[PDB]
Symmetry: D2
Subunit: 333 residues, 4 copies
């Protein structure tokens, strides 16, 4: 294993924090606007997932978590980050700014070599664990792993459709506060309705069902669209999908299906429940999207609605490491 | 005008304070577990809509609000509440415990006569402002006015449908906490997942869109269903409805259809905006349902989603007041 | 060991939950208002501390947790609960209604034997770990363990005082919502300003600075008093304590005083942090009170302010376990 | 009357909307990072305060509110702002950046003349309404007007002291969120424990009790100091003062010192109540500081604790208004 974490906040850290609990190589970190000694404190403590326990302290000028020397670097320009002097071959791009094959590639200049963009990209392919896989192979150097939501409907589409089809469909995500969403009104000079007070409000949000779904499981590319509400909730989020379906079924079969798949092949990615209630239970639930056989579920013959919940902050976080992995296997020879 | 408001917490209250921004008659209130000096203090102040101005004091042993003595009484059972010695014509039920003609009816015994249920009834007619109207005449003694969510969907159904037909559809209301929602887990002995931490979580919710709607705008009795989530938000609540239409059209006209309404006949009930953002603004917006033309709206050819926000606590408040009135011109002759 | 936990809400549970991370003996549980089957569900799930892993299910008509048969009973009257056919000698009392020697003693009639009140009581002893101990011996049958604030302030008192003496103090507790605190106003028929909306508001609250502290640590019994603020927070709580000191010293020795103590004697019960920030970290932190060296601290000669945070839900829960324990050692022989 | 408001967010704004409720002059705004038509929308609508009714529109390239052409401008450095072509006599400084005599004088260069610091300064005088007054006269061109908390303490200390004296005192401010306080952990490079997540947590806050009170009411420059907790709460706030008195007296006369002051001199600045509870009622209460008489107030013969709330957003908003007014009486001749 060998990895690298360009920048580090929400994704940046759990991705790291994830690497660790999994079997991922410690690395190099590189985050301007955060000094070596804030990261220790800044990754050791977590409002929502919280604290940690490793040997989390600095030493010979860098971060040593759990007794393992992970260089940390800084530079407001990646064509500059070392990985030559450094020697971490797989880089993860966190930042937010550096989303396109053009903006990533830039890694190398410095000295570097293979990349994964932790967000949705306009040119870069767009892996999602279920289906990612095959579509994926070694030609690929700057792969991109489509978001949290996409990762939540991905699974859930695949089941639904292939198995009953999906002819047309809509989706509501009930997002739970994000980095952006301001503490109390203000600018979103671009994002305007989320310039507003993030804690008193139910606030719409343009999103992407369109996005990876079409872009990942292409038989679709054109049948799903969808929206989002951002709510006080600190970390969960329930994706709301309604389908005109195709193969008349019984809400029931919706059940069985997702179950048969929770174990069969979506094994670790889709989960399935009926042991109800839940709510932002999932907080810390390394998973991908879980099916709630019974809650917010409802049928009308071939017109159905399902609920799937994520953990936005870290189901995804585990995935980057799984995307991250999978490739090594293939990539490595 | 003579009123009566059996009980008073959320509806009981704002329906009190409703009455007086109108041209309503004061009365008699009758809330067990609540003494006269609690009420004044308990009406003067509202965390959500709050404070007031009225001459808010006890006098010659009853409530005097805005220098206009309105009795108040207490008894755990309405077949005993005065209205005899009282002289309070139309009586409104808030409590919750007394929902059906069987249970309202009982009013009389004490000495009574004219009544409306602030909630869904089993047997009771079920007027909604827009449509309620002509279906309703004086045969009806104990008529009910189905709820908050419903009140927000009538309007929007009736435009949509009548106008593009609606063949099948689905709905998500994002409720904002209620009376019920435990402040930190606990029994819901009957209502289990909203027993849970109503301020950490998004919690599913059986609801009634087929409810009032079907049993209000008959032609549908059967094509709509839906569910709910209670989110932190102290007072708002966006109704999400998806429809397979009937008459192909373009989310556009969904636009003008709702606009012509807001003005034409759906005057003061349905509202419509295009000046976006909005959020939990609506707080204190005597209205009923507001189409949000552009927000959490999406089209796909004859498959669509519309978004309208309520005000659970008092858009409905003004309605009882109008169901309440309407009743009088007709009823009184 | 052999226990019994009469009832189970916030305390009954984490008290259960408690026994088990220790080496406490499971038992019998006895809660009107809750079926067997809802317990399992109500015990393994938790907004704030959540999920568990236990062999969490029922069997030959009881609760088996982690393959260990704990009987469950329900009766609205404890002089009625088995402890007889039951064989469980130390009962714990969570309810809330049964706070006095008079009220507890009760137990026995049915058949039973030895008890602790996880509440503050009129007449029963009032043990708190740090100090409690010695003043405690086998005479006491229905001894009680004064609350969490107290649990919070004993150590922090005892350290300051014995050590720089303490001539007069005041205290503010920033409490973090409770069972009571209605989700949207309402009755508080005896408790009024915590009948109001407790997710919108900073709502004061009478409290027991005086309570258990005088009553626990004698020499004070007249020098401390306080108040509380309930804030949105789901679970932590910070005691703010001002003292006119006695022995001049410097904010500093306040520091070593507590640190030297974190290790010395208040060992597991007092904490001490200089590694700042913290905030409602402590979430799930089996402890007692932790002193935050530098945060919410301030000096001026011998007039000072100190800050310790709790975990009202579950530092306290460990303690009942400890109180519950020690007794055994004394009591048993 | 002529005003001018450099920048405009939380204060900038309500000082606009404050002026207006007044008899202030409209003006010209000047807020880089915000377009003419976002202003209008951003002036119009408020999560906490909200909406308006004004003739809120853009016209001949400026904002006309309430049919009053108030010019707007944009550039990232006021030594450049017009006020010469322009003609708005008194400039008010909001932004944040530009807090010193040095920093505002800067204004001039462009063309301008008179100024106020809606913020604490290091070199600019510090006027609070109660005491600012006389200390103030015309040799002062770029005057400063201490902040929220201060404004809340000023009156309360002023009565207490003068009147019972104040020897040693400490304070707790229970602030409610801020422009800054990140909604999900994160940077606070300068201010770290507030970089942490503002919505989950109770979070310390350095403050200045020391600040303007010392530098306001001369006589104390040295007897007080304090801290702050931010909580969820969107907008209200309560200053917690504990004091070693000097003149003995008893909780009570604390009452009437404060009550006779509301009427007498602190007339419309300190307000005082006993019809208790309140809470984050205050929301929009043009005022300054209100003494809650009986709420988390406690004596012990010359050691007390008085509680007073503010409305940080806009009690201070009206103040700028009259610091501003007053200046004009004098300033003009």
């Amino acid at each position: 294993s060998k990895i690298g974490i360009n920048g580090f906040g929400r994704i940046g850290r759990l991705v790291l924090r994830a690497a660790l609990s999994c079997g991922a190589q410690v690395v190099a970190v590189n985050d301007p606007f955060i000094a070596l000694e804030y990261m220790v404190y800044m990754f050791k403590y977590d409002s929502t997932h919280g604290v940690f326990k490793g040997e989390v302290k600095m030493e010979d000028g860098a971060l040593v978590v759990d007794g393992k020397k992970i260089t940390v670097f800084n530079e407001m320009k990646p064509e500059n980050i070392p990985w030559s002097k450094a020697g971490a071959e797989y880089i993860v791009e966190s930042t937010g700014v550096f989303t396109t094959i053009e903006k990533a590639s830039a890694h190398f200049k410095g000295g570097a070599k293979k990349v994964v963009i932790s967000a949705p990209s306009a040119d870069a392919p767009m892996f999602v664990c279920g289906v990612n896989l095959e579509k994926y192979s070694k030609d690929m150097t700057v792969v991109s792993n489509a978001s949290c939501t996409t990762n939540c409907l991905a699974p859930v589409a695949k089941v639904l459709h292939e198995n009953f089809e999906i002819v047309e469909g809509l989706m509501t995500t009930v997002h739970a506060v994000t980095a952006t969403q301001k503490t109390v009104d203000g600018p979103s000079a671009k994002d305007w309705r989320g310039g507003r007070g993030a804690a008193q409000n139910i606030i719409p949000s343009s999103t992407g069902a369109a996005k990876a779904v079409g872009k990942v499981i292409p038989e679709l590319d054109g049948k799903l669209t969808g929206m989002a509400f951002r709510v006080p909730t600190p970390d969960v989020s329930v994706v709301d999908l309604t389908v005109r379906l195709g193969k008349e079924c019984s809400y029931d079969d919706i059940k069985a299906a997702m179950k048969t798949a929770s174990e069969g092949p979506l094994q670790g990615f889709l989960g399935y429940t009926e042991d109800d209630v839940v709510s932002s239970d999932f907080i810390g639930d390394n998973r991908s999207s879980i099916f709630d056989a019974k809650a917010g579920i409802q049928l009308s013959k071939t017109f159905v609605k399902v609920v799937s919940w994520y953990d936005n902050e870290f189901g995804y976080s585990q995935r980057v490491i799984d995307l991250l992995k999978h490739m090594q296997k293939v990539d490595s020879a």
